[PDB]
Structure formats: structure tokens, C-alpha cells
């Protein structure tokens, strides 16, 4: 509920080149990831957060979600590259 | 010459891990002016203790990690 924002009419009268679509995707993903890693590490360092059941039960979910997200991005990327190889490769 | 020197020196240094320098010695020292043992004076109202030099010194040094020096009122070998 804190600081929500959404873009509208994203494709209604302008379209990006694929060259840019890839670049925006990469950037928006890489920064979110790096911030999530820092958040986890900080929640581990603070002595008041690693010793309270309420805060540990929150940290378990963060680690689970990070691990699932990075695994899904990696698998889809590998599979999509494979198809371009099968197209170009004589 | 370089290879021989480097090898020889490294082996000399390793073998000298089996040698030992720190032979202990024993000093016997007679006290001329006081009794060696600790004493207890059972005052009719209170028991009081005067420790001996051995006790005092042991208690002082106990658990020390560093060397001693300058009691007051080749370089590699040293």
C-alpha cells in the first residue's frame, strides 16, 4: 500500500524498438535484485531482527521468493536463447 | 645456484622446527628475613590471613600472556 504507481496507455500510440525493450527489461530487473539482496543481508545483521520469531517468519518468505525469482528468470532466458540458436545455426 | 640456495634454506628452516631452545632452569633462593609460609592470626574476634610471597606472586602473574621486564621498586635469537 506504500508508494504505488502504475503506467497507463503504455503501448497505445507509441511502440519501442526491441533494441530498447530488452534494455529496459534488463535494467528494471537488475536493480530490483540488488536491492533485495541488500535488504536480506541487513535483516540478518540487525541483532533485534534475527532473534524475534515475528521477524524470522518474515525473513523466511523473503529468502524463498528471491530464490524462486532468480531461478525462473534464468530458466526462461536459457530456453529463449536456445530457440535463436536453432534458428540461425546452419 | 639460485635454485640450490632457495631449496637448501627452506629445508634448513623446516628441520629446525624439531629443535628446542627453551630449557628451563631452577633457582633455589633462601629467605633471610622472613618465614616462607603464609600465616593465620586467630584474633579472639576475627581470623585474619597474611599470605606468603609465593602465593602473592603466583596470584599476580596468573594468566599472563606477555613477557616480563624491568622489575622496579643474533638479534633473532634474543
Amino acid at each position: 500500500v506504500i508508494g504505488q504507481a502504475v503506467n497507463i496507455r503504455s503501448m497505445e500510440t507509441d511502440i519501442v524498438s526491441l533494441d530498447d525493450r530488452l534494455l529496459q527489461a534488463f535494467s528494471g530487473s537488475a536493480i530490483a535484485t540488488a536491492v533485495d539482496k541488500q535488504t536480506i543481508t541487513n535483516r540478518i545483521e540487525d541483532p533485534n531482527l534475527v532473534t524475534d520469531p515475528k521477524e524470522l517468519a518474515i525473513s523466511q518468505e523473503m529468502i524463498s521468493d528471491y530464490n524462486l525469482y532468480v531461478s525462473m528468470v534464468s530458466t526462461l532466458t536459457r530456453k529463449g536463447v536456445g530457440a535463436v540458436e536453432t534458428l540461425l545455426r546452419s | 645456484y639460485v635454485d640450490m640456495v632457495v631449496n637448501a634454506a627452506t629445508m634448513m628452516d623446516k628441520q629446525n622446527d624439531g629443535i628446542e631452545l627453551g630449557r628451563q632452569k631452577i633457582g633455589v633462593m633462601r629467605l633471610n628475613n622472613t618465614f616462607v609460609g603464609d600465616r593465620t592470626y586467630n584474633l579472639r574476634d576475627q581470623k585474619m590471613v597474611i599470605p606468603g610471597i609465593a602465593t602473592a606472586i603466583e596470584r599476580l602473574l596468573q594468566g599472563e600472556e606477555q613477557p616480563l621486564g624491568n622489575i622496579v621498586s643474533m638479534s633473532l635469537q634474543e
Binding site: 520469531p53 515475528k54 517468519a57 523466511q60 518468505e61 524463498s64 521468493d65 530464490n67 524462486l68 531461478s71 525462473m72 530458466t75 526462461l76 536459457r78 530456453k79 | -
Partner: protein, 75 residues
Amino acid sequence: SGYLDDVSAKFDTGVDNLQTQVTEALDKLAAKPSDPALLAAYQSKLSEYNLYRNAQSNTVKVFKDIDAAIIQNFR
């Protein structure tokens, strides 16, 4: 958000007030550690808490392993 947080939340909306009750009972007991009436209540609340937190954590673990298996079979 996510489904594993949905499962985690399905407990916390299940035990309405326990999270508060435990701390409140602790404060009372700490005020008079030798009242058997207080002791008897704290034993119950503390046990109910220990069990709630263990069941929650093991369930989240299991659903995490189901998803991690499926995302490998995507390959």
C-alpha cells in the same frame, strides 16, 4: 506479495489475537512471578504459540519445495 505469503497469512488471520495475548500475559506474570493463577494461564498461551509458529514454518517449507521442483521441470 505471492502465494507463499498468502499461505503464511492464512495462519495469521486464523489466530486473531494470540500474538497480543502472549505478551500481555507475560507482562502480568512478570509483575507477580509467584501467582499460580497467572502461571497456569501463561503455560497455556505459550504452548499454543510454540505450536502455531512451528506448523506455519513447516508448511511454508513444503510449498516452497513444490514450486522449486516445477520450475526445474520447465527446462
